[PDB]
Amino acid sequence: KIMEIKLIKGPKGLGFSIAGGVGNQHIPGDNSIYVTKIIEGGAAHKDGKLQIGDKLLAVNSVSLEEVTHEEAVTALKNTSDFVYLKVAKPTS
């Protein structure tokens, strides 16, 4: 299940933590970026769509598939104010 989440970047960012990445696998065999924590009162929390365990596909034009952890952190920190976050809700 793929969805697009609309977020306004707050002073402290998008308001979630990530794990994963090429060379830093969160799930054995998977390079994907995963949401690990939703920050209380942050943009992602207030929107209510994003959940722990969701896979990030893209942040605006930037793919987060088959990227390093540092690449995804950079991407998420340096987005514009208005963010279209594409995510995949896990099945298992």
Q: How was this structure determined?
A: X-ray
- For 91, the token pair is 């099945």
Query: What DSSP character marks residue 29?
Result: T
Ordered by where they begin, the domains of the chain are 1-92 (2.30.42.10)
Closest C-alpha to 66, from 32, 27, 34: 32
User: What is the spatial distance between Cα 77 and Cα 67, in angstroms, rounded to a whole number?
Assistant: 15
Query: What DSSP character marks residue 9?
Result: -
Angle at 37 between CA 34 and CA 41, to 5 degrees: 130
Identity of the amino acid at 70: E
User: What is the spatial distance between Cα 68 and Cα 63, in angstroms, rounded to a whole number?
Assistant: 11
Closest C-alpha to 85, from 38, 22, 41: 38
E-assigned strands of the chain? 2-8, 16-20, 33-38, 55-59, 62-63, 82-88
